[PDB]
Amino acid sequence: WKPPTLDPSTPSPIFGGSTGGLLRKAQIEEFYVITWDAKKEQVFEMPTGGAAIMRSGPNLLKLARKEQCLALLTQLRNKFKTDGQIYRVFPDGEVQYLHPKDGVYPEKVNAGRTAVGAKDRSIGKNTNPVAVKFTGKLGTYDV
Amino acid sequence: MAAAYLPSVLVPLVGLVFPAIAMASLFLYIEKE
Amino acid sequence: SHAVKIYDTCIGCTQCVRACPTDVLEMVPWDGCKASQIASAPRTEDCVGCKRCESACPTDFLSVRVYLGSETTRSMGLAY
Amino acid sequence: SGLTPCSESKGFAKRQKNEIKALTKRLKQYEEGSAPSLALKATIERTEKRFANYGNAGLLCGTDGLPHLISDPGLALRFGHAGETLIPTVGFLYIAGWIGTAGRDYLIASKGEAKPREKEYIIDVPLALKISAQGAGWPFRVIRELQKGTLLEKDSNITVSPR
Amino acid sequence: RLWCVQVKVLRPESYWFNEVGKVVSVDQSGIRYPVVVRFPTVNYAGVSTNNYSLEEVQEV
Amino acid sequence: KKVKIVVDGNPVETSFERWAKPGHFSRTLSKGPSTTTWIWNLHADAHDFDSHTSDLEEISRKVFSAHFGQLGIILIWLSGMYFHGARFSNYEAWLSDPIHIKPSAQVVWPVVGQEILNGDVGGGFQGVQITSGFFQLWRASGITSELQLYSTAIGGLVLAAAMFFAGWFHYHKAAPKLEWFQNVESMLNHHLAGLLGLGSLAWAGHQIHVSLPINKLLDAGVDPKEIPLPHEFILNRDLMAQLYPSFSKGLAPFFTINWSEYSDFLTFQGGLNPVTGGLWLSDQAHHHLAIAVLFLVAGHQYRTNWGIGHSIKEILEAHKGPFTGEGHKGLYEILTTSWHAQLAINLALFGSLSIIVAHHMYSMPPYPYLATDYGTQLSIFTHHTWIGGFCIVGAGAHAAIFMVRDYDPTNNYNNLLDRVIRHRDAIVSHLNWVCIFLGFHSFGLYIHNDTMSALGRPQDMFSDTAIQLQPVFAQWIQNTHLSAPQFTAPNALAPTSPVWGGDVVAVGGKVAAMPITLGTADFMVHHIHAFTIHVTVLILLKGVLYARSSRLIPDKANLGFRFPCDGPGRGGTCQVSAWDHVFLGLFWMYNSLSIAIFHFSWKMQSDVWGTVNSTGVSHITGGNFSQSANTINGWLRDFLWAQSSQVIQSYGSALSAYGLIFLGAHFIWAFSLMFLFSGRGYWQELIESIVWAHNKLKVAPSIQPRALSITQGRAVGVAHYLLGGIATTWSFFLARIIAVG
Amino acid sequence: MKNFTTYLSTAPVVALIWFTFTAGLLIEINRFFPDPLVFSF
Amino acid sequence: GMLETPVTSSPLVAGFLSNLPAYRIGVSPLLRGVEIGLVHGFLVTGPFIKLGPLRNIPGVAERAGCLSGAGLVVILAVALTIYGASAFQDPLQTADGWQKFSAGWLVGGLSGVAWAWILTQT
Numbered sequence A: 001w002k003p004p005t006l007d008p009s010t011p012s013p014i015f016g017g018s019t020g021g022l023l024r025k026a027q028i029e030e031f032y033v034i035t036w037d038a039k040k041e042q043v044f045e046m047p048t049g050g051a052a053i054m055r056s057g058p059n060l061l062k063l064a065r066k067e068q069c070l071a072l073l074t075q076l077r078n079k080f081k082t083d084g085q086i087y088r089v090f091p092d093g094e095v096q097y098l099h100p101k102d103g104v105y106p107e108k109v110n111a112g113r114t115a116v117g118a119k120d121r122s123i124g125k126n127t128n129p130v131a132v133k134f135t136g137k138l139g140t141y142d143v
Numbered sequence B: 001m002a003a004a005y006l007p008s009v010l011v012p013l014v015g016l017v018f019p020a021i022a023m024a025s026l027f028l029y030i031e032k033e
Numbered sequence C: 001s002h003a004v005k006i007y008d009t010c011i012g013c014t015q016c017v018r019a020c021p022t023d024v025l026e027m028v029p030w031d032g033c034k035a036s037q038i039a040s041a042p043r044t045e046d047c048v049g050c051k052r053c054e055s056a057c058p059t060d061f062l063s064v065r066v067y068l069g070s071e072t073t074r075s076m077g078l079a080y
Numbered sequence D: 001s002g003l004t005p006c007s008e009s010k011g012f013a014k015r016q017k018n019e020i021k022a023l024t025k026r027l028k029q030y031e032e033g034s035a036p037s038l039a040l041k042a043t044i045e046r047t048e049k050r051f052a053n054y055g056n057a058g059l060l061c062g063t064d065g066l067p068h069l070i071s072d073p074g075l076a077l078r079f080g081h082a083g084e085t086l087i088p089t090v091g092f093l094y095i096a097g098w099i100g101t102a103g104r105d106y107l108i109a110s111k112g113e114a115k116p117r118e119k120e121y122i123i124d125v126p127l128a129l130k131i132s133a134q135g136a137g138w139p140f141r142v143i144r145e146l147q148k149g150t151l152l153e154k155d156s157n158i159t160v161s162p163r
Numbered sequence E: 001r002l003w004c005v006q007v008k009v010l011r012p013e014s015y016w017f018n019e020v021g022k023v024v025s026v027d028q029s030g031i032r033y034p035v036v037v038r039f040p041t042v043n044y045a046g047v048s049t050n051n052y053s054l055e056e057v058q059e060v
Numbered sequence F: 001k002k003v004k005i006v007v008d009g010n011p012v013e014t015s016f017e018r019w020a021k022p023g024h025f026s027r028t029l030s031k032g033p034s035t036t037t038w039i040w041n042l043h044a045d046a047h048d049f050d051s052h053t054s055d056l057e058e059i060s061r062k063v064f065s066a067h068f069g070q071l072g073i074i075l076i077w078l079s080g081m082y083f084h085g086a087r088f089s090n091y092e093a094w095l096s097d098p099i100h101i102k103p104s105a106q107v108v109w110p111v112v113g114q115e116i117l118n119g120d121v122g123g124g125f126q127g128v129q130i131t132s133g134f135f136q137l138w139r140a141s142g143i144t145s146e147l148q149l150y151s152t153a154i155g156g157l158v159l160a161a162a163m164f165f166a167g168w169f170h171y172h173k174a175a176p177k178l179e180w181f182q183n184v185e186s187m188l189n190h191h192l193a194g195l196l197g198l199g200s201l202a203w204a205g206h207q208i209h210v211s212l213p214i215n216k217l218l219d220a221g222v223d224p225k226e227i228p229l230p231h232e233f234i235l236n237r238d239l240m241a242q243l244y245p246s247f248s249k250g251l252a253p254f255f256t257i258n259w260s261e262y263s264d265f266l267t268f269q270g271g272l273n274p275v276t277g278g279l280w281l282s283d284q285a286h287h288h289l290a291i292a293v294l295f296l297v298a299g300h301q302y303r304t305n306w307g308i309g310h311s312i313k314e315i316l317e318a319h320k321g322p323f324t325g326e327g328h329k330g331l332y333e334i335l336t337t338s339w340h341a342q343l344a345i346n347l348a349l350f351g352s353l354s355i356i357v358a359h360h361m362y363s364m365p366p367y368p369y370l371a372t373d374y375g376t377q378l379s380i381f382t383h384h385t386w387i388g389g390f391c392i393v394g395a396g397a398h399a400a401i402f403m404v405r406d407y408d409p410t411n412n413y414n415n416l417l418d419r420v421i422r423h424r425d426a427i428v429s430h431l432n433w434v435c436i437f438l439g440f441h442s443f444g445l446y447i448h449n450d451t452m453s454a455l456g457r458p459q460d461m462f463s464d465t466a467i468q469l470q471p472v473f474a475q476w477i478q479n480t481h482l483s484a485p486q487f488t489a490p491n492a493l494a495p496t497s498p499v500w501g502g503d504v505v506a507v508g509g510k511v512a513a514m515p516i517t518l519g520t521a522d523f524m525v526h527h528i529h530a531f532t533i534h535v536t537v538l539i540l541l542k543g544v545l546y547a548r549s550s551r552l553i554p555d556k557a558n559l560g561f562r563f564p565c566d567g568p569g570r571g572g573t574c575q576v577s578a579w580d581h582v583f584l585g586l587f588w589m590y591n592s593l594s595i596a597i598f599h600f601s602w603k604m605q606s607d608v609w610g611t612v613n614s615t616g617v618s619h620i621t622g623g624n625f626s627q628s629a630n631t632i633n634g635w636l637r638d639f640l641w642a643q644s645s646q647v648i649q650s651y652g653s654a655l656s657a658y659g660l661i662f663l664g665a666h667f668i669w670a671f672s673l674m675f676l677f678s679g680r681g682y683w684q685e686l687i688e689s690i691v692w693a694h695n696k697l698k699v700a701p702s703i704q705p706r707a708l709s710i711t712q713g714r715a716v717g718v719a720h721y722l723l724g725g726i727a728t729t730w731s732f733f734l735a736r737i738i739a740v741g
Numbered sequence G: 001m002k003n004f005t006t007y008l009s010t011a012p013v014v015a016l017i018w019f020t021f022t023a024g025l026l027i028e029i030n031r032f033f034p035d036p037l038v039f040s041f
Numbered sequence H: 001g002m003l004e005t006p007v008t009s010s011p012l013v014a015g016f017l018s019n020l021p022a023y024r025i026g027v028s029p030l031l032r033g034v035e036i037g038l039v040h041g042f043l044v045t046g047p048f049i050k051l052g053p054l055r056n057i058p059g060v061a062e063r064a065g066c067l068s069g070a071g072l073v074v075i076l077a078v079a080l081t082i083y084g085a086s087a088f089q090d091p092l093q094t095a096d097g098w099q100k101f102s103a104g105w106l107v108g109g110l111s112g113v114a115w116a117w118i119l120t121q122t
């Protein structure tokens, strides 16, 4: 499996526009792009408010937050049974592929993933905050 | 009171001139990168 | 960014991963539980801190813990 | 406390006279034998009986002409004020122990059933009436359970938070 | 350790610390918390079961 | 296609089996409690029929039978009101002397000293003075004896039992199907022509044949026992023609279209009856006849079974324009499938109607001796204002519930609902700016006046004797309505109300109605009203528009209508739900309506109500509204501090219950702040310690004690806040206006 | 009749009956023995 | 994406906005500040003259109102100056451009205050 590339010529869903879309943060900080392949032309609910018509075939939607893209992807997976891909786009043009990160959805266990944030103890075995004073650590969970 | 002109100078200074300079300088300080 | 830690009481029920609205969590292979999988938090820079994962966790006490830390644009959930 | 008995207090008698005078002033606008006249006359009779009973009870009155209660069990016993606080204390403590013991017995009886939570919102009324009648003899059973050590759960069997 | 045997929970952060539950099953594949215990009361999440290690449960 | 009766026979067995199973209606709650949260959840979810089942037919049947139950309860309440008038009242004595006798229909039992509340209301009677206005309503209907009140009480209880029977019958025996409920064209035709139209016609018949001659004899000075009974006027036409000579001509002028012969009892006088201070009953009879004809015409608009008539779907789909996309398309499907959208519309209009009723009943008092009963006038204005505000907040709530639960984007593409959602940010931002501007330029005027008065500069104030803010538009409207009988309504003898101008209507030496002049203080308080209404609208509309999503939480519809938060993340998301917007809108509606009723009370006590002596009119507070209502200090001193003297010195009199309720309502309002200012984590930990104490003595309950949920904590806080504040104002108002009125 | 008596045994109905009995007992005691302030006869 | 309306996307609206000194095609930022300051500083003296604490004293009212307007202009010039030092750490959206804009605002505002005083005196 390889990470897909973003095609910026992908058509957008039929939408009349809304006041809930992108702002200055998209131009100067980052924005997000969700792409999916619709089986048929149908009406879906925008995460920013209102009803849009997704076109048959590939679709491309630009959204301000990753949470908006994942809410739309949850709607697409649960209601329309459609998979999707989420990218992060930077103002310099760099595109970072986000979801699903290794091609498998994160709820399904996949080989080649490494545990990060794992602690080899139960939560009641954390030390006392007096033990991490003047150490620079975030807290007893950081040691 | 002695030097009765002093409230007419110091009250505008402490009440208007000093807070304006203080907020301007603190705003420039908290916005500094 | 917020800190998300997974403790070894995790039973690999995948509920925290399904509850996450910003794709912070995933299941990796493991051997410490019957389901042979544990939750992991590789993308805590996208964690908003909603603690939906802790609401979804069935273990007592929680196996997934979210510690709110320094706030960024992503963690404050800002679209502007 | 420097108080005077209400039977010889001038403020007490003045208050009785003023209350009777106000009720009689209200009384003169109605004809005799009418319902408001009878109601006001009954109120006047109740006022007179109440002031007489408070004077006869040995209540102590302040400078305001109002009865003051004595709650120290020493001063109440050696000066005849035990009916103000001490005997009501004994009566309340008996009834409160009755209610608490009846509730405890009902909870303990419902603990042994197959659905212990069911009896807490759908009351076993015959069982509650039987347990409620048995709460009269609460001090004997409670003091025996205290001596036997069965009144208290052991500390090892009670959940606590980490310290 | 047996089946349907009363055990006392010794995990301090558990909701059922110092409380008695019934053993549902004990896993034999060497997992970290193999003892499955059913409790008559729910915790704050409405859950009635939890997994404990061998040292976290004492037979009563 | 065809409008017809369709029911299902015996759908639900009539049995007590589910009465013994609390929570039976809910899939989650039927399993029984584990914690104490189940106790509250059972009452909170009891009437959420759409949560119990997704079948619209079962929901509709439940709603229909619940409405029958509510009608039965209302009829029980009304029959009790008529019974207490018949049995425990001084209504006949008040009929003989309606000026010097205070109405009373509640008598307390003599026990624990509470018989002091049976005050000397007059008429050889002792009881609690009532402010509901039933006596004036009964006098206007022509009721002259306790026997007629007894008959209405018995007949009301029979109809109450018929309503409870119909609710049982139409749920357990013959429950109508879904297509019966969706006949909105037939429902509108029947409720306009048959309910409102025939109701107005029947009441016009009662007014003409009973209310007009009995009240004419009452105002002529005839003793009520010597007045003939209403059926004597029905049977003897000559007795009717003695008072109204057109009755000698019979029904011939009606059928020969000589309607002007009926001008003696079908009038257009306008104004008030000088004897009673109420509206002319002949005017009301003509009003109800005209309203009946208009509603009978209005009820023939919609097509049911005979081809002619309008289809509401066609009207909605035809009304679209260039700015509005698909227009009203899809609204018929919304309003025939969502009970919550219908409840939102109907609650908004019903609440607005209640407030309009309050204003029109004070300004044009329609009952004899209502206007000079200042307690009744203040009470009914305040009551109907509060009912209106609560219904409008409920309209916002159920609009939000529709948006969360019943909204479908597939059926709403580029229609009005979709386009409103698509510019919700513009709407909310513009409304926010309007609210900020209104708050500044209304409340800051008061702050400016308070600062100027406190700085010893009354010439720099906003007042009539200073910088003036004259409400010139309202003054022009008042002058136009005063001059209406001259040109724009020449057949009206008088203006609709004395409040527009003209003379003082006095009944028994007291002002019934008089001109209400508007100055700078009226301008300021009216813009305060505009500001508070706009903020309440902002909260409720923001809750409706962002109920499904926002930039903060994009999947808010999946969390539901009523949820506490989405966690401490994104900076903190407490109270994002539309329910919490209803929760805040309740406070703001309370603030708005409190200012409205304070404005009413002070303005009528200062400029309308009072005693008419030989020299002129001496008002209750002596015209101090125009002098001091332009400052916050003026309000706090001259209204709040001055007018609360009656409720704080009411002890030892019949009004002492108002002093007790004043104190207890302050307590209840303060008690609410512990729920509002705190959170359930503290209470759960405190409950853990208390549970430890109960576990030590083996008295820990099996139903595990939990602190209230976050939403329940908010609901309890706002409920106790509203109850405490409203009952504080209630006791203050009633004690003040009964003692000084 | 069993289901009806089970409904009457639910907590709010039992509370209504018990508090009606207790309130009535207190009311009738204060009616038969008006103004009791002290335990004196 | 972005909602467009006749208020936002008219030829007449875009024509009116383009002729404003903040949006004109080629104008130095000092001159844009000069026109903006002239227009604003002329306007602000009106409320100060007609509603100030000395509004009922003839002669002193206009002078006090114009001095108040000049003080407001000076305060807003300070606010513009400290805005530019923070926001910049289109020639208008630069540090030097905003410095020239602030200087032009101050000059134009004082000129507008003086012109309002002259007009009230004539």
Ligand SMILES: CC1=C(C/C=C(\C)CCC[C@H](C)CCC[C@H](C)CCCC(C)C)C(=O)c2ccccc2C1=O
Pocket: F674, F675, F676, F678, F679, F680, F683, F684, F706, F707, F708, F709, F710, F712, F713, F714, G015
């Ligand atoms: C005080 C408080 C509590 C504690 C209040 C609780 C737990 C409610 C207690 C209500 C009653 C009194 C509990 C017992 C109810 C029984 C049915 C009564 C039986 C007693 C007999 C006499 C009838 C909260 O839980 C809370 C939660 C969220 C925000 C604020 C608050 C808050 O302010």
Ligand code: SF4
Pocket: F564, F565, F566, F567, F568, F569, F572, F573, F574, F575, F679, F710
């Ligand atoms: S404080 Fe309460 S309401 Fe706010 S985010 Fe935390 S849990 Fe939710």
